[PDB]
Amino acid sequence: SDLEVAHYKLKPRSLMLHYEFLQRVKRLPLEYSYGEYRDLFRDFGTHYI
Amino acid sequence: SSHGCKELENALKAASGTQNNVLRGEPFIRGGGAGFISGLSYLELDNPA
């Protein structure tokens, strides 16, 4: 059984980020240092819906 | 006096049976409350309507 109960769409532009994600992006080093971006992904994943 | 018999029996009873039973079906619904969708789309084999 596949049941579907709503359709969701996110706006394409001018999204309002979460405080925690906002802060964690701010703290990202301008220099490429993989481990910090990896920690970003580990905390919040790689993708949004 | 002299006598002699030779006597023989051979019997073969082969048999076989097979049965294939196949049932399929797919209710599909659009519109209506998701509870009534699931409650109707579930195939009751004694009343597929």
Q: How many CA atoms lie within 13 A of B30 on its CB side?
A: 0
Looking at residue B45, the DSSP 8-state letter turns out to be T
The data reach a resolution, in angstroms, of 3.3
Nearest to B32 by CA among A4, A38, A31: A4
What is the C-alpha to C-alpha distance for residues B45 and B25, in angstroms, rounded to an integer? 9
Which residues from B are below 8 Å from A when comparing CB atoms?
Answer: 34, 37-38, 41-42
What is the C-alpha to C-alpha distance for residues B2 and A1, in angstroms, rounded to an integer? 86
What is the C-alpha to C-alpha distance for residues A43 and A38, in angstroms, rounded to an integer? 9
* DSSP-H helix ranges across chain A: 19-26, 34-44
User: From the CA atom positions of chain B, what is the Rg in Å?
Assistant: 31
What is the C-alpha to C-alpha distance for residues A1 and A3, in angstroms, rounded to an integer? 6
The dihedrals phi and psi of B17, each to the nearest 5 degrees, come to -145, 150
- The answer to whether A1 contacts B34, with C-beta atoms less than 8 Å apart, is no
The dihedrals phi and psi of A23, each to the nearest 5 degrees, come to -55, -50
Technique employed here was cryo-EM
Helix (H) / strand (E) containing B36: helix B34-41
